[PDB]
Amino acid sequence: IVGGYTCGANTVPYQVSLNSGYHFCGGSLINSQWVVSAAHCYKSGIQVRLGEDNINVVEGNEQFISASKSIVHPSYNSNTLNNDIMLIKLKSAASLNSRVASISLPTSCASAGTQCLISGWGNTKSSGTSYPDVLKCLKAPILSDSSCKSAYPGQITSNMFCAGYLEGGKDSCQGDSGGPVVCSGKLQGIVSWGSGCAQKNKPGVYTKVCNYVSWIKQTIASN
Ligand SMILES: [Ca+2]
Ligand SMILES: [Cl-]
Ligand SMILES: [Cl-]
Ligand SMILES: [Cl-]
């Protein structure tokens, strides 16, 4: 996250770190047994790490649970990142508490201008590299579809939205991928892609979760 702020420990209790020897993506807990992330975060041998703040220090509220199964969206296209969403089932259920909590799925899509919370342990520099040990947060609005499409002509589908600031300075970045965009208490986005980080007229691009709610519920219920 670039241009953000330190969230505070466990202030984002649905935020998960996906670990394969090292943090490589975020994700969101949606019930005690299931996490939603980006399809482009797919890897074998994922360990989900819940209740994290400093991902390099055991601070005492963590739960580390191996994934038992990953399900990538049937229509995921790795070339375009269309349908950039995947579900991850935990081998044992998470123990839910104030620091490890699920986030509601949307019942409808959010409108342009709605303020959202984006979070992750990704890079905090716009033109350099520096990775934080603690969770970073950014408040950012959903952008108009016309602004999003103008920024990325030929690349935005109905399953994507932009959020952030056209002036630049504030955005998600590498290592935030797969993590949450929460608006009015609902998981509306997944950190998906963009052009650089915090560049002018290049806001972050997010998977539009509200299009996937039927698929998520049917998939979880069947697996
Ligand atoms: Ca920790
Ligand atoms: Cl359309
Ligand atoms: Cl990434
Ligand atoms: Cl379930």
What residue spans define the domains of the chain? 1-12+103-210, 13-102+211-222
Contacts of 58 (CB under 8 A, 6+ apart): none
**How many Å apart are CA 207 and CA 83, to the nearest integer?**
7
Spatial distance between the Cα atoms of 204 and 191, rounded to a whole number of angstroms: 8
Q: What is the DSSP string of 94-146?
A: ---BTTB---BPPSSPPPTT-EEEEEES----SSS----SS-EEEEEEBPPHH
Reading the block at residue 9, the tokens are: 């420990």
Task: Give the integer Cα–Cα distance in Å for 59 and 176.
Answer: 21
Four-CA torsion 93, 95, 100, 103, nearest 10 degrees: 50
Equal fold, 1-12+103-210 vs 13-102+211-222: yes
For residue 46, the SS3 value is coil
**Residue 24 structure tokens:** 């490589």
CA–CA distance, 203 with 162 (Å, rounded to integer): 6
C-alpha neighbours within 13 Å on the C-beta side of residue 108: 2
Spatial distance between the Cα atoms of 85 and 100, rounded to a whole number of angstroms: 22
Whether 130 is a known active-site residue: answer no
Question: d(Cα 55, Cα 134) in Å, to the nearest integer?
Answer: 6
* 84 within 8 A of 76, measured Cβ to Cβ: yes
Return the SS3 of 216. helix
- Residue whose structure tokens are 């702020």: 5
- Check: CATH 2.40.10.10 for 13-102+211-222? yes
Residues with CB under 5 A from ligand 2 (ion): 158
* Residue of 17, 37, 84, 176 marked active site: 84
119 is known as an active-site residue: no
What is the experimental method? X-ray
- The angstrom resolution of this structure is 1.8
φ/ψ (deg, to 5) at 143: -90, 155
Alpha carbon distance 99, 142 (integer Å)? 27
Q: Identify the active-site residue in 40, 53, 119, 176.
A: 40
Numbered residues of the known binding site: 52, 54, 57, 62, 171-172, 174-175, 177
Distance between CA 30 and CA 87 in Å, rounded? 10
HEC secondary structure over 74-97: CCCECCCCECCCEEEEECCCCCCE
Q: CB neighbours (10 Å) of residue 201?
A: 13
211 C-alpha vs ligand 4 centroid, how far in Å?
19
23 is catalytic: no
- Domain spanning 1-12+103-210, CATH architecture: Beta Barrel (2.40)
